[PDB]
Symmetry: C2
Subunit: 142 residues, 2 copies
């Protein structure tokens, strides 16, 4: 099986890297918007806060597109548990990120700061590292 199966593994990793990366980029643009919503309107800097929130929204939608691609390539047997785990972490971090867009949609920075977002970022981050370790080891077995 080795070509077809190991290429499947690389394509599942690429798509997951694209999902993780675009969620970190959503986190970044939500951050850049929240600081400008705190600084108010006099501040020359405050004025891009809606562009930034719009960029955040756009990269989350792109993370969700790559994730569905990732989910369409069925996990190989040994990959099933980390892939299940990734899905759990992914949904908690996607949701955190969605609620943050929802708050800034109406300028609620108080609720933005009150969400413990980093905890969820970190859990996905560790899931990602575990998926990547597990896929390297099947790839050097395939």
């Amino acid at each position: 099986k080795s070509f077809v199966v190991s290429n499947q593994l690389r394509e599942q990793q690429g798509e997951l890297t694209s999902t993780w990366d675009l969620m970190l980029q959503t986190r970044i643009n939500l951050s850049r918007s929240a600081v400008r919503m705190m600084m108010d309107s006099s501040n020359q800097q405050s004025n891009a806060k809606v562009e930034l929130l719009d960029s955040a929204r756009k990269t989350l939608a792109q993370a969700a597109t790559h994730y569905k691609k990732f989910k369409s390539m069925a996990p190989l047997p040994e990959m099933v548990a980390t892939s299940r785990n990734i899905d759990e972490k992914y949904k908690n971090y996607y949701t955190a990120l969605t609620e943050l867009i929802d708050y800034l949609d109406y300028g609620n920075t108080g609720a933005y700061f009150a969400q413990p977002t980093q905890g969820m970022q970190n859990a996905m981050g560790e899931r990602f590292a575990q998926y990547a370790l597990s896929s390297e080891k099947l790839y050097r077995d395939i």
Copy 2:
């Protein structure tokens, strides 16, 4: 050559994913610190601004460790140009990120906001996508 060479390619991609990801995480923690340095001292939220700057510093040092690992696996002939390009983009974004740590080290948020960091983030991001496209196509040729 196919096993040894295609494994080399996957290991160079993994290390580069680790570099890109840790630089995005440095960007995130610098962001979280800059907003708390803007909010001042009354603000319960302002008080983690030095922990956050310290986390940023730590993930940049980790991005630089994985990058040296990436650079130690010599680019295969067709990968030499994107690998050169990645190095250029990487150094401009590593430097941007370093100057941002340097500003927040003494609470200079004015200089933090004045740096056009995102432009450099974006150039590295496009380099990364181009490297990943080019490596997929050599990998399906190897």
